[PDB]
């Protein structure tokens, strides 16, 4: 028996020690080997309440990755508060491995196994576990990548539906490929990502159809970011240490939906992207400059599994609700995976 509690978790992995890839070495040193036979017993006709927005596991992962980033990814240059930072800025080996987070004595992890669970509230089908599933510390903005899927419907999650200031996390029931490339051998920073327009607009068509059910069959509207930094306004990410900022403007093509056999909205989509070495860390910690790019063939391929969203304010339109891409932050990246979990203290 238990009571809701927060406590400090630990991590586990099959990280490889010879890999200099940082996740391998790190997890090799900061996390442990797996339990080969973990037990899980279901409790009959029990309902439990959840709150996906407060699980220090999030705080622990964010803190950890931040501490790492602060101590691992020294840029050639950092501009922070009142200090000025200079250095050599070397190349790395980079490739995330799965991380499991596991609980100690006197606490346990509760899991909502309700296939249609929204992340807070009662879960009818609940299980208990010793350790989590493997979570990629996928750093992204706008879009959550390579995450776990809802086993049934696409799931919408949010702290306050009425509050447009509250980020909306979209949980996919179908992965979407994005294929990003700087081809071998002139703009040395120019790259592009190709995505299948059809898969996306189809699922999305379905999401809209679905959204109306929640928005009184009201008009569903996408709008471009009102404005802001590329770091917050674009899907920003890292491939082998190189920094991408990709413009998602082309994606909210309203005219591209209605099953109307149409042009413009078609074929394999090749989106142009560009790289910046110098950024303001969203940690609010300052500015960073990294060294220049490798010679040769550059490629990062990703599966899309989630989305962060911001809503336009301006009630009384009474027909429409307006939305703009961009939602909260990476804590949401960890959150999107955690809606069904909470740590409890055993009593």
């Amino acid at each position: 028996v238990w009571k809701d509690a927060d406590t400090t978790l630990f991590c586990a992995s099959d990280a490889k020690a010879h890999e200099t890839e940082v996740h391998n070495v790190w997890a090799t040193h900061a996390c442990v080997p797996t339990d080969p036979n973990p037990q899980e017993i279901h409790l009959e006709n029990v309902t439990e309440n959840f709150n996906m927005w407060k699980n220090n596991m999030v705080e622990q992962m964010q803190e950890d990755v931040i501490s790492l980033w602060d101590q691992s990814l020294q840029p050639c240059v950092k501009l922070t508060g009142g200090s000025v930072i200079k250095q050599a800025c070397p190349k790395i080996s980079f490739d995330p491995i799965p991380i499991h987070y596991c609980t100690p004595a006197g606490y346990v992890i509760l899991k909502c196994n309700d296939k249609n669970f929204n992340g807070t509230g009662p879960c009818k089908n609940v299980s208990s576990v010793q350790c989590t599933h493997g979570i990629k510390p996928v750093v992204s903005t706008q879009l959550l990548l390579n995450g776990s899927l809802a086993e049934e419907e696409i799931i919408i999650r949010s702290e306050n539906l009425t509050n447009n200031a509250k980020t909306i996390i979209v949980h996919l029931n179908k992965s979407v490929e994005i294929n990003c490339t700087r081809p071998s051998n002139g703009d040395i920073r120019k790259a592009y990502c190709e995505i299948n327009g059809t898969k996306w607009n189809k699922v999305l068509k379905q999401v809209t159809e679905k959204l109306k059910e929640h928005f009184n069959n009201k008009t569903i509207i996408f709008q471009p970011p009102s404005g802001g930094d590329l770091e917050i306004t674009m899907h920003h990410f890292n491939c082998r240490g190189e920094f991408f900022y990709c413009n998602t403007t082309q994606l909210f093509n309203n005219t591209c939906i209605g099953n109307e056999t149409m042009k413009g909205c078609n074929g394999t989509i090749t989106l142009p992207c560009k790289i910046k070495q110098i950024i303001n860390m969203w940690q609010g910690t300052g500015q960073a400059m990294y060294a220049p790019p490798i010679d040769g063939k550059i490629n990062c391929v990703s599966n899309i599994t989630g989305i962060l969203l911001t809503r336009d304010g301006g009630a009384n339109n009474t027909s429409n609700e307006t939305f703009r891409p961009g939602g909260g932050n990476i804590k949401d990246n960890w959150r999107s995976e955690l809606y069904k979990y909470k740590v409890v203290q055993i009593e």
Partner: antibody, heavy 123, light 109 residues
Framework: QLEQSGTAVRKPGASVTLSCQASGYNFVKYIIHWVRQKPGLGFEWVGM????????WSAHKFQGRLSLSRDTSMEILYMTLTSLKSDDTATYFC??????????????????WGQGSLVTVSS | QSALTQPPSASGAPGQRVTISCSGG????????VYWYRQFPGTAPTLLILRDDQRPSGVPDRFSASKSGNSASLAISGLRPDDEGFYFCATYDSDGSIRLFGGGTALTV
């Protein structure tokens, strides 16, 4: 802790620039709603400016017209508006909130307010 | 959503008990709560009533808030003179959307 400040008059049709400097911590986790005053009356939400990131928001009603701005490091702000009008004379304001997102108090409200940023708009 | 509708207040007298609501088009639970404000020269317009908190640090007890219906009621048993100033309701409008404000009221009389 909280000083708004601006100059009074410029001609209509044009554009403008507005500050509100505050404490760093208040810049840590508090968005600041800009509101405005009219001769002797109650307030108006214009938009919100987050402390973080700089993810901007204000009503869609300026889509071609609007831009939002700030300063994380210098603990300070800027706003800018288009389409000034001769009738547009009155005081502006800035306001915060812990927002069920600061502390474990978890309240949303306009805690402290601006000294007011005067306006006098004449063609 | 939601609107608002306020009479000017109030040609009172230096002490008598007064009760003023901040009533919105939501004539239901809304405005579910409100912040009523001081609003002075060179000053911060200074809030009076919090919801999800009481009165903060540096705040005294004589201001109580109670409603039912849309029938809000910002109440003073003991009127005061530097209430010779302006006071406005602030909206949650369900933490948006969107947040409105009241008609303002002043009692110097």
């Amino acid at each position: 802790q909280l000083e708004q400040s601006g100059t009074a008059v410029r001609k209509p049709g044009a554009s403008v620039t507005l500050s509100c400097q505050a404490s760093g911590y208040n810049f840590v986790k508090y968005i600041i709603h800009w509101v405005r005053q009219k001769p002797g009356l109650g307030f108006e939400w214009v938009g919100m400016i987050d402390p973080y990131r700089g993810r901007p928001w204000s009503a869609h009603k300026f889509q071609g017209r609007l831009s939002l701005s700030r300063d994380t490091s210098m603990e300070i702000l800027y706003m800018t508006l288009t389409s000034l009008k001769s009738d547009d004379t009155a005081t502006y304001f800035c306001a915060r909130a812990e927002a069920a997102s600061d502390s474990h108090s978890r309240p949303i409200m306009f805690d402290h307010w601006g000294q007011g940023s005067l306006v006098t708009v004449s063609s | 959503q939601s609107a608002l509708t306020q009479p000017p207040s109030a040609s009172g007298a230096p002490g008598q008990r007064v009760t003023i609501s901040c009533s919105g088009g939501p004539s239901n639970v809304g405005g579910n709560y409100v912040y009523w404000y001081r609003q002075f020269p060179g000053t911060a317009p200074t809030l009076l009533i919090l919801r999800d908190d009481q009165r903060p640090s540096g705040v005294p007890d004589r201001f109580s808030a109670s409603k039912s219906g849309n029938s809000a009621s910002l109440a003073i048993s003991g009127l005061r003179p530097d209430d010779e100033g302006f006071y406005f309701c602030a909206t949650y409008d369900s933490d948006g959307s969107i947040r409105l404000f009241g008609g303002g009221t002043a009692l110097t009389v």
